[PDB]
Amino acid sequence: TGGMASKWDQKGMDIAYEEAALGYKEGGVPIGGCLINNKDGSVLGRGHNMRFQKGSATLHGEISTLENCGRLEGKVYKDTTLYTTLSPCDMCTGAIIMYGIPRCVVGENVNFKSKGEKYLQTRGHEVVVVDDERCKKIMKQFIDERPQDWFEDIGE
Amino acid sequence: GSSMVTGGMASKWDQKGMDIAYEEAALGYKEGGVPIGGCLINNKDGSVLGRGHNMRFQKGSATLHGEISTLENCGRLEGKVYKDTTLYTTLSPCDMCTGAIIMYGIPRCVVGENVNFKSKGEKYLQTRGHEVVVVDDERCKKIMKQFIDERPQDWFEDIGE
Numbered sequence: 001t002g003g004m005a006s007k008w009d010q011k012g013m014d015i016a017y018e019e020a021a022l023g024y025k026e027g028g029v030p031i032g033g034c035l036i037n038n039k040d041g042s043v044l045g046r047g048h049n050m051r052f053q054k055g056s057a058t059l060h061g062e063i064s065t066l067e068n069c070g071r072l073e074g075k076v077y078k079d080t081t082l083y084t085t086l087s088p089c090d091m092c093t094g095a096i097i098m099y100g101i102p103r104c105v106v107g108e109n110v111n112f113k114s115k116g117e118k119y120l121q122t123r124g125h126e127v128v129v130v131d132d133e134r135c136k137k138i139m140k141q142f143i144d145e146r147p148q149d150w151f152e153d154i155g156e
Numbered sequence: 157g158s159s160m161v162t163g164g165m166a167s168k169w170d171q172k173g174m175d176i177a178y179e180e181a182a183l184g185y186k187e188g189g190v191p192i193g194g195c196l197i198n199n200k201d202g203s204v205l206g207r208g209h210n211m212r213f214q215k216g217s218a219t220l221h222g223e224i225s226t227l228e229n230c231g232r233l234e235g236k237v238y239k240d241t242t243l244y245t246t247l248s249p250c251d252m253c254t255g256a257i258i259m260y261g262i263p264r265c266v267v268g269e270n271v272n273f274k275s276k277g278e279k280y281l282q283t284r285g286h287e288v289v290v291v292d293d294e295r296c297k298k299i300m301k302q303f304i305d306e307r308p309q310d311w312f313e314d315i316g317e
């Protein structure tokens with residue numbers, strides 16, 4: 001990219017936001033994601049945080065997105081972008097790193113940012129922060145109303 | 157990582173923790189899965205918060221590595237509950253599982269072996285302030301070597317290659 005946005009990035013972030021809004025409406029943490037094949041723009045999967053929905057300690061948005069893509073040949077991930085409405089925690093960062101997903105496009109990092117955002121860069125990934133106000137507003141709403149649930153979701 | 161890293165001390169619960177992790181790995185192996193198991197133990201009293209094994213083949217899962225399945229099986233917990241625990245894993249954690257340990261602040265990780273696999277995560281745990289102990293458990297090494305030998309492409313899939 002050279003820092004150029006991808007032709008698929010608007011689509012990816014819109015899907016991630018749709019997933020965040022759906023999870024909000026389900027009574028969960030409003031964090032959504034999607035994984036797009038950069039070669040053809042195909043959406044390999046989409047998901048949102050399922051902590052409340054499933055009683056899940058590991059289904060963050062990014063993890064649920066990856067789960068929803070199913071088992072894949074490792075090479076597939078090497079030319080994908082993971083879209084996440086919120087800057088990834090250390091766990092989801094680790095997932096991106098493990099699979100070698102080269103680009104992580106982040107809705108916002110104002111309500112939350114871990115050391116993972118920079119660690120992705122150290123590990124050779126491209127991180128794009130869009131500063132999407134849709135994402136920021138829904139996440140801020142959740143934190144305002146359910147702070148202890150939010151803290152649980154990031155292990156505090 | 158740092159030149160000044162050092163392996164952590166043993167805990168009175170390590171035999172218990174690695175034996176549970178290994179039993180989980182062997183159960184997963186019998187189920188047709190990747191033989192990697194784990195458990196999470198409270199360092200103060202030895203209680204087992206949860207245990208699990210890799211569920212990639214059992215569940216068609218791209219995220220349920222042994223360590224992730226272990227954490228899932230522990231359920232939702234207050235953040236504080238993790239902060240004096242050990243995660244036992246039969247295999248040195250990949251970057252994903254490392255990240256889970258870091259995110260929850262699980263301060264100690266005991267690793268069955270890192271001969272068959274080792275990621276940057278083992279050292280990154282230490283960089284980030286976590287204790288790591290590698291016990292070089294022969295049972296763990298044997299079962300993982302067998303899996304990699306017999307099903308190499310399935311193993312590569314499990315580590316994203």
Ligand SMILES: O=C1NC=C[C@@H](O)N1
Nearest residue numbers: 031049060061088089
């Ligand atoms: O679902 C999520 N919770 C917290 C942070 C981010 O990784 N995603």
Ligand SMILES: O=C1NC=C[C@@H](O)N1
Nearest residue numbers: 192210221222249250
């Ligand atoms: O289940 C696992 N697969 C690979 C590595 C380790 O993190 N665990």
Ligand SMILES: [Ca+2]
Nearest residue numbers: 148151156234
């Ligand atoms: Ca609390």
Ligand SMILES: [Ca+2]
Nearest residue numbers: 164165286287
């Ligand atoms: Ca110490």
Ligand SMILES: [Zn+2]
Nearest residue numbers: 060089091092
């Ligand atoms: Zn996360």
Ligand SMILES: [Zn+2]
Nearest residue numbers: 221250252253
């Ligand atoms: Zn792993």
